[PDB]
């Protein structure tokens, strides 16, 4: 509403060109050892867990 303002409609082409770098990344994953599952590394995850550490359930 004030001072500086666009001179021209940005063209479809130049719209999309901005967005070349907007592409996404898939999360990085490793197979949960001591259990069949995928999990992101350096993480505890609740199909499984660790050893000298805490986790889900045991009965």
């Amino acid at each position: 509403a004030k001072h500086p303002v666009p001179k021209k409609k940005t063209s479809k082409a130049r719209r999309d060109a901005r967005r070349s770098h907007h592409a996404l990344t898939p999360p990085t994953l490793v197979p949960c050892p001591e259990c069949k599952a995928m999990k992101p590394p350096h993480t505890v995850c609740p199909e499984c867990g660790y050893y000298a550490g805490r986790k889900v359930l045991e009965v």
Partner: peptide, 21 residues
């Protein structure tokens, strides 16, 4: 943004992509 992630992948991978996206 995220649909374009899984386009053309085994059903098995997709589930995990979405899991941790």
């Amino acid at each position: 943004l995220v649909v374009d992630l899984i386009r053309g992948k085994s059903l098995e991978e997709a589930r995990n992509i979405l899991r941790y996206t």
